[PDB]
Amino acid sequence: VIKPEMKIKLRMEGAVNGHKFVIEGEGIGKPYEGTQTLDLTVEEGAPLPFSYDILTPAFNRAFTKYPEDIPDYFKQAFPEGYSWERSMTYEDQGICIATSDITMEGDCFFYEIRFDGTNFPPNGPVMQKKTLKWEPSTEKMYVEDGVLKGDVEMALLLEGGGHYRCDFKTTYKAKKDVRLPDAHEVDHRIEILSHDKDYNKVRLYEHAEAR
Length: 211
Prior knowledge:
This protein is an all-beta fold. It has one domain (1-211): Beta Barrel (Green Fluorescent Protein), CATH 2.40.155.10. It contains one helix and twelve strands. The chain has one helix at residues 73-76, and strands spanning 6-16, 19-30, 35-44, 82-90, 95-105, 108-118, 131-134, 137-144, 147-158, 163-174, 184-195, 201-210. The longest helix is centred in the middle third of the chain and has 4 residues, at 73-76. The two termini are 23 Å apart.
């Protein structure tokens, strides 16, 4: 039921360091090539006082190129869909939790996303918007408790050229039983292709391939 091109519509509600916001997104991707692009718009809470980058991995592993001999936990889960739960722990004790519930109708995915962070220092790189991009990453995927888990060590490149590290832990929960894969890895690259001055409008791209 996963077509070679799938559309995407999403809504994120959240709060970061007490600043509430709402972002909507629409876009399109190619699930079997592991690529997608979203156009995202801040609908409430503009201008965001924090780095947009902390949000971008919350904006769907159905968009992953899986080799034909690794079971695709994500494409198998449709049309019913799946949800995920993610902790993101930053090196300066900023902490975020995000969840998403992902359904489908026809050639379109729908994401209902919740995002919350707190404890970001007011002069650190997130609240001072000093981040440039995420570095390409490798997520370790493995089965535990009957579901699929991923761990990835993430790094945000900073203005002036250091890195700001974050550990991601994700639980992925299909809504029906599916064929479980062996342990494997997903390589990612995520990039903001363009944005307006205060990131009220953002074009966001991801390429992901399992190996």
